[PDB]
Structure formats: structure tokens, C-alpha cells
Amino acid sequence: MDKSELVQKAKLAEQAERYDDMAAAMKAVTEQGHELSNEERNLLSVAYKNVVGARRSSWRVISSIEQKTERNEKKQQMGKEYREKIEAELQDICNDVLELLDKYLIPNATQPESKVFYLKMKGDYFRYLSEVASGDNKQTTVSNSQQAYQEAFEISKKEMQPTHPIRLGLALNFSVFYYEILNSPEKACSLAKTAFDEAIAELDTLNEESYKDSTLIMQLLRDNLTLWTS
Amino acid sequence: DREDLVYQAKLAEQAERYDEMVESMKKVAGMDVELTVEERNLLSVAYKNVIGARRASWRIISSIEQKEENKGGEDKLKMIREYRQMVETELKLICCDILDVLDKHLIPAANTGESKVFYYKMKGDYHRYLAEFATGNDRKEAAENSLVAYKAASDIAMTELPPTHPIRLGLALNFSVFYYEILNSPDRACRLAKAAFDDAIAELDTLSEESYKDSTLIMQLLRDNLTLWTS
Amino acid sequence: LHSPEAVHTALAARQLQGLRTIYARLRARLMGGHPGPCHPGHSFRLLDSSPCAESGDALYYRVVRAHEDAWHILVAKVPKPGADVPHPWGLELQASLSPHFNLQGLCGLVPEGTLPGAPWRGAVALAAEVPERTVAQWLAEACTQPPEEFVWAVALLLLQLSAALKFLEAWGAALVELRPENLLLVAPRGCATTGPPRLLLTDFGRVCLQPPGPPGSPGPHAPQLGSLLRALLSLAAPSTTPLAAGLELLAAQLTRLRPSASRTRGALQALLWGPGPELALGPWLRVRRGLLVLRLAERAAGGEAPSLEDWLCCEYLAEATESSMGQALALLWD
Amino acid sequence: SPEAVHTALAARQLQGLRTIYARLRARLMGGHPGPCHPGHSFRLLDSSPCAESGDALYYRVVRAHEDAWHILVAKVPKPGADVPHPWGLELQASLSPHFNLQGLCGLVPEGTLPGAPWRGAVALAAEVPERTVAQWLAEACTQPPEEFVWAVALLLLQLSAALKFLEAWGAALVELRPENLLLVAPRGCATTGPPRLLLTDFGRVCLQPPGPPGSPGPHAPQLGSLLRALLSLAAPSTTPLAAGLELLAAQLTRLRPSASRTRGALQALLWGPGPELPWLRALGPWLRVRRGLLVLRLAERAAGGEAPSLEDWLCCEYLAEATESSMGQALALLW
Amino acid sequence: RTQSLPT
Amino acid sequence: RTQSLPTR
């Protein structure tokens, strides 16, 4: 099937709210070895974040039930197996996306904003694996997540405007990794403060078209700082 | 098995994994034993979320097709039509699954007048969801089989359930909607909804508060549909 | 006002809400006084040392059930010795169902040894209603009437039977045989004894599971009804009477087309009160609904109570539609 | 055609109301004793007043003839009572039976019941008394319900039918007072609902020969005074009927309308049209609707086992003989 | 716009 | 409670 028909099926599966179909279409676009345009990057990202978000939500509910059912053994042995069923789907989808990023997207990407976008994705999917992994596999996964975010940050600090929506997007998610995965709330506070202060100082240089996005992300960076400080 | 298959259905409900809730409850339904009120509710909730998600996508894809039919390209419409027909195939497989469970296992096994009215309503509804998207002969056959099932529920309900009972009110709500939408007789739809609402009004004074609040919710759905169809 | 279509519409809607209220008030008096199920607090005593009635399957003796200075009359349904019971699933059905006008309800059971010196041994069911006669005994008396009164009474009994069989077809069950000696006649509650009797179906020992099948399938009772109907009419003195000739057409159509009990009930109502062969069914139904309400008001002023026949007519016209009446006319004149 | 359909239904429903009115009248006017004859015999049931009224005392008496049996009431003149028009006591024996008039069936002479409290011959009435209107007001003024206005309007509707019959005859009542007016239960229809009202005071009725209107009803000032007495004894205005009766009471003393016109205004306040209805044009379609609703009301009560009340019979007499011309006059006197 | 029974 | 970058 031709590339324009795969992209049109992805835009149709999005509106119909069938995200498992949308991800299969955008995987098939990605495997052709062409570099993606801005609409195609957004369709790939929206597809997989909806496919993973369902599993993250279900795993939190069933993992909570296994903490609450402290009394009864013949129930606990069912709760455990059902968590481990969900936990294996979550690990499969993250390894599906990390294969696209390693084999196709990052080795073709030859522009700063494009590399920062994919290195943020590589950071995020190792982060989602670290939410559910345990033992030496957690330590291995946490290292790979930090390596991806820092390489995005050494680019984004140098090649991009301090106000740019994806420089804000990277500073937001890299601060969440320090707060929730490395349990270092001081690093999370000072990073989020630094990025918010850098962005605020230069909004006078920014057109309304970009400012709409920058201010909407900057509010979330202030919300996290307010929660963590309170 | 039975008490653990119900627990797997309660886990899959809270995880929002309704396709696994369906397999858990379909195993319970296949035992040929009278289901409790809890197990009847789990069985309905499972299929109703699984079919409901597909119905919503089918209406959106159909709506998009009607906007593109304003002289859009025939290749783009051919793609939209192939995608819509794929979603219709899933609706056929979900309906024919529950209708076979109802016919073989649940309807023949049912001991009570409440149980038989509930299962003939499910058979009426799952035949009605096939009549939403089918055309020609297969819309006629779906409309006939749905009509027969709601009549059989009604003929039993008049003996077995009070006119204020939530199942007897719910039957009149779904069966009047079937006349307005599927057969398209707005007069019969109004007449049936008004008669069922009038029969309830006479008896609310006899109820407990926790009964009254449950019956009156379905009566308010009858008022709303009557208010709409009167225009 | 000053818009005749609005005047005609508002009165037609209010006359129907009137008929549905009349039907419910009369039903509540006919169905009233049903005893609740037996309890550990209740106690029993025997009025009859020989039966108040005999059915083809059972002997009935009156039993008084009393508790805390409230009491009821019930009948001990003693099975006749040596009788067959083809389907024990139908006996489990009889004890499951809620109260219906034309089906025998059971109030429970008298356990072994309770009534000393009783006409029976072991435990026996108690039925709610007290019977007069079987239909087989009623025919041996009533077929001596002038034929235009006999045929009206027969048509009202077949109307009540078709409603009891309609319920069983909706439930998914069937009678393997229809026998007049197993159909009972009861005096309707609060209504003058010279009216029509209330009919009970009682042979649940012959009720069995019948999977309903596809919508094109034959009805399970139509060959039995078409053979019962002609056996009853064979007793009548021949006349050209429109109802007598109409029932002999319905008998031929039953055994040929094999319709359901609900399509059969619609043809019996059409022979009794419905559109003639000459039928415009909308204006006709509105005129008849208005003439029935006048009959009920003019007699109430006289001081007469509504009869069972008037309640059965109120039931037909309150549910009739130009669809149902067209199907009834099509079955009969075909 | 809806024309021939609603033409035929309107004609058949009016024949229905005429039949309902005649069947209820025949039960409410049933059991009336026929005239005395020299073969008759009597027994006294009671030793003290079976009723008391402003000018008469009442005692209940068995009558027997050829093994037929009746109960009647001897009307003893109260000590100190007087008769302004003795011709009116002849009129009481001369008139036909009427639902709202105290009729007489014959006489009991002295020595027939020598153990009774009276002496001399005493006339006997056909009805058995309960209470006077003044005695019913003595109850009602102590515990006056919010529905007292409705009960009063129905008593005045019945009184206006009696005074209409006198104005249609050659006569009028000279003085009107509630201490003589008597109440009895409706035969075969009795409940907490309205009593039958009897006009009693034939000692105060006289001839009325004028052809021209004069004051168009000789009773009309007296009804105005009686209605204002009843309204001033009642609680304040809490229902539109109370305001309507206050507007009627002024019109009665202002225009002095005939008792037959006064009756129509009371029927219009109870069941008829009002200013909320142009008012002279809608009356035809309004009757076809209003008649249909009464036939339905009667049938639902029959389905419920409730026999028709005296209120339902008075409503049935109004809607049978109602017309667009009579309703236009009733509306003109009210507004 | 028309409503069937919710769950 | 804590926010990560939203889905659009």
C-alpha cells in the first residue's frame, strides 16, 4: 500500500478513536526509511502514547489491588498473575517503539529539533519500562533513560531557543525522571526552576503562535514545582 | 471455578479490560445454571462496553464519509468505505457471540420471571444493534427478530413484574426507542412510552426511598424521549 | 379550541387513558384476595370429607388456613391414583410462576401427618382458587341452550384459553394435549354468578419445554386448538349465525396455517367485537371505544356492576391498533 | 369523514346523559309513600323530637295497609309558631312531588296515636328529616373546612331550583330563613357528600300574578342577603369560587334577576365556563369536550365500585339541558 | 439524541 | 498528581 494511504488511514483511525489501528499504520509508514515530517512525527507520537497509556493505567489499578488484598492467599495468587499479564503487554509496546527509534528514526535524523524529539521519546519509553521493572533490570533501564535525556539536553541547551515548546517539553519530562524514578527531588526542583526562569526572561522575543504552546507547557512546570515545594 | 471466574471478571472490570471480562463471564454463562443478580449484571456490563466502543467509532466513520461524499475523491471514499466495513465486521462478531450464548445456554435454563424478562431484553437489544448498520434483506430479518424478542419480554413482564420495576421500565424505554429508530413509527414509540410512564405514576407512593430513586431515574428518561419525539 | 383536529385528538387520547384506567381498576378487584405462600406460623383444618370438585387428574377438598385471626379457603389438590404424569418439569413450572388470571397458582403444601383422618396420605399441594366444574361437565349441561347463546359462551371460553397458551408460548413451553376434563371453571371475584365463568388451565403435568425456533416456524398449539374448537361446535344445533360460521372458518385456518396463540387471540376478539368482513379502521376504533365507555356509565347509573365480558372487551379495545386488526381480518378472511 | 363521525358521537353522547339523569332521578326519587286511605293503620316509633326546626317539631311514624309498610313523619306545629299565608299550607298539599320541596302524604287524626305528645290532627311528610341548614351551619362554623364554600354553593344551587319551581308556578316565598330549611340523606347514594335540601316553609308563600318583570325575581334580594350571611360566616377568600360568589351577591341586589337566571350563574361558578375561556363563540366545542369528560368520570368510578354522588347527578342535569344561549346569559350576569 | 438505558 | 507532557 502507498505511503499517502497509510497516513490517511492513521488520520481516520485517530478520529474514530481506534489507537491500536493508528499505531500499526504509523509503524508501517516509519519502516519505509524516509525521514518523517512534523505531521507524521505527531501521528506516530500520539498513536503510541495512547497505546501505552491504557496499560500504565490498568497496571496501577491491579498493582494497587495486590497491595490492598493483604488478608487472603488464594486471592493474592490470582492478583499477581493478572498484574504480570498486563506488565508483559506494557514491556512489549515499549520495546516495539524503542526498536523504531534505534533502527530507523534516530540514525536517519540529521537536524537538532528532530534529534531532540526522538531522544526525548527514547528517554520516555525507558522511563515507562522503569515504572514496572525490578532488580538489576530496573538499574539497567534507569541508566538507559538518563543517557537518552542528557544527550537531548546537551543538544537542546545549545541548538534551540530557550522558549521553544520542545525545549520546555524536554525540561518538564527530565525533571519528572529525577523526582519519581531517581527519587532526587532537589535535582527536579533546580532543573524545573532553571528551565522556567530561562523561558520567562525571553517571552518578549516570542510570537503569539509559539507563545500559546510555550505558556501552556510552562504552567505545568510551575504546577510540578508547586506540588513538590508544598 | 464459578466463584473465581466471577473474581477474574471483577478484576478485568476495574482494569477496564472488557474483552477479558467477556471471556471470564462467557465461561460462567456456559454452565447451564441460574445466574445470580450480580452475575447477570457482570455479563451485561461486559458485552455492553465491548459493543459500545465499536458503535461509537462506526457513527464517527459514517459521519466522515457523508462529509467526504460532497464531491470528494472516489479513491479517498473507497479507503473510508473499506475502513467502515472492517468496523461493521467486528459488530457482527460481537453480536453473534452473545446471541448464541443467550439462545443455547441462558434463555432455556432460566427459572424465574425476572430472569426471562432480562434475557429476552438482551436478545432484543443485540438483534437491534445489527439493524442499525445492516441494509436490504438483513435489516428486515434483524428488525423482525428484535420485535419478536421485545414482545416475548413484554408478555411475561405483565404477569411477573410491577409496573414501577426497573426491568419493566427499562424494557418499555428500549422497545419504544426500537419503534422510533429501527421501524420508524414515531406514533407507536410515543404511545408505548406514554403508557408505561402513566402505569408507573399510579404506584410510586407504595415504594421505599431506595426503590423510588431507582424507578424514577428510568421514568425521567421516558419523559425526555417523549419531550423530544413530540416536537 | 377553534381547531377541530385538536379537539378530536385530545378526546381520543383521554378516552384511551380512561379505558386503561377502567381495565386496571376491574383487574385489581378480579385479582384481589389471592392468599400469600404458606408459613411455619399457619395452621390447617378440613371442611370436606368428599371432594368439592373432581378433575380428570385430581380431587379437590376445601382446607381452611388460619393465622392470628386472619384466614383463607384453599383446596388440597390430591392426585387421582393410577394417573400418568408425562412431564414433571411442568409441575416445577407451576410452582415458579406469579399469579395469572387463567393459570392455576399454588400457595404451598400440607406436609405428611398434619390433618388426622384425612382422605389422602403423604404431602399435597394447596391451590389458591376453589373450582365449580370442569369444562367437560359444563358442556353436558350448556349444550341444551339455544345455539346463539351456547356459541357465545364457547367463544368466550376459547378467548380465555388462548391467553393462557399465549403466556406459555412466550415463556417457551407447550401442552402436549388439550383435554376439557382438565380445564376448570371458577366464579369471578366480586361479580354476579350468572355472568361468564373464569377459566383455569391446570394440567401442568403435560407442559414441556418447547424451544421457540425461527420467526417463520409453526405455532405449537394450533392443531390442538383447531381440534378442540370443532369438538365444541359439534354439540351446537346448526344455525346460519355469523359467529358460528366465523368460528368454523377460524377452525379451518388454525389447522391449515398453524398461527401462534397471539394471532389466534386476535381473530377471536375480531369475531366477538371487531371489524366485520366489510372493513377506515382508525375512525372505527375511536367510535367503538366511545360506545363502550357509554355502556359502562349508563349501567353504573342503573346500579349494575361491570361483568367479566365487559372487562374482556375493555382489554381488546384498549390494546387494538390498525395493524393488529388488519392482521386479524387477514387471518380470518384470507 | 370526521364531520359525520363527531356529529354522530355528539348526538349519541347527549342521549347517554339524558338516560343517566333519568336512571339516577328514578333512584333518588324512589321509595316515596303514596296517599293515605281509610284501610290504613299506624304505630309511633319514638317519644321525643326526631327533628326540630324554627316553626315545626317532627315525630316518626309507621304506616301499614294490606300488609304494605312505610315510614313517614308527623309535622307538629312548634308552640308559638304562626302562619302569615294559610293559602300556602293549601299549596303544599296541591303541588306535585319535587326533589327539593317538603311534600305531604296525608293526615293523622287524634286517637289514632293517643300515646303521642300531640293532640288534634297532624299532617305527615314523605321524607325523614336529619337537621336544619342553621344546625349544619352550627357544626360548620365550629370546624369550617377550606371546602365549606363548595358545600354552601351546592346547597344554594338546590335552593334556587326550589325557588325556580315557585316562580314557574303562580307563587313566591315571602321570607327566607335557614332555621326552617331541612337536610336529608340521598336515597341509595349516601356518603360524606352533599345532602338533599328540602324547602319547608309553606306557611310564608303567596300568589304572584304580574306578567311584566317588576323586580325580575321576587326572591333575588333575599338570596343576596342569605348568600352574604353565608359568605360573612365563612372564612376569607382562598379559592376563586369565593370571589365569584361575592361578585354574584352584589349583582343579585343590583339587578334582582329571576331565580331561573340565578340558578344558571351558580351552575357556571361550579362547572360552567368563565372569563378564562371570544367567550360567546367557543361554547359549542366546549360543551362537546365537557360532556365527554363527565361520561368518562362516571365510568372510572364504576370500575372503582363507587356509586354516583348527588354532586354527580346535579352536574349531569346542568350539562344535559345546557345551551349556548343559556350559558351566555349566565356569563353576562356573573361578568 | 434519543436515549436507551445506561450501565 | 505530578504532570508529564500531555498527549497532543
Author numbering:
A (entry chain C): 3 to 232
B (entry chain D): 3 to 233
C (entry chain A): 128 to 406, 419 to 473
D (entry chain B): 130 to 406, 415 to 472
E (entry chain P): 66 to 72
F (entry chain E): 66 to 73
From the paper:
PEAK pseudokinases are molecular scaffolds which dimerize to regulate cell migration, morphology, and proliferation, as well as cancer progression. The pseudopodium-enriched atypical kinase (PEAK) family of pseudokinases, also known as New Kinase Family 3 (NKF3), is composed of three members: PEAK1 (also known as Sugen kinase [SgK] 269), PEAK2 (also known as Pragmin or SgK223), and PEAK3 (also known as chromosome 19 Open Reading Frame 35 [C19orf35]). Crystal structures of truncated PEAK1 and PEAK2 lacking the unstructured N-terminal domains revealed that these pseudokinase domain-flanking helices fold into an “XL”-shaped helical bundle and facilitate dimerization by forming an “XX”-shaped high-affinity dimerization interface termed the Split HElical Dimerization (SHED) domain. 14-3-3s are ubiquitous regulatory proteins that act as dimeric scaffolds to modulate their client proteins through a wide array of mechanisms, such as altering protein-protein interactions, inducing conformational changes, regulating subcellular localization, and sterically blocking access to phosphorylation sites.
Strikingly, full-length human PEAK3 purifies from mammalian cells as a homodimer in complex with an endogenous 14-3-3 heterodimer, and we have obtained a 3.1 Å structure of this complex. Based on the cryo-EM map, we were able to unambiguously identify this 14-3-3 monomer as the ε isoform, while the distal 14-3-3 monomer was most consistent with the β isoform. The Ser 69 phosphate group forms contacts with the positively charged groove of 14-3-3, including the canonical Arg (ε-57/β-58), Arg (ε-130/β-129), Tyr (ε-131/β-130) triad as well as a Lys (ε-50/β-51) within the αE helix. The secondary interaction between PEAK3 and 14-3-3 in our model is quite unusual, because it is located outside of the 14-3-3 cradle. Residues Gln 144 and Arg 147 of the αN1 helix within the SHED domain of PEAK3 form a hydrogen bond and a salt bridge with Asp 200 and Asp 201 belonging to the 14-3-3ε αH helix, respectively.
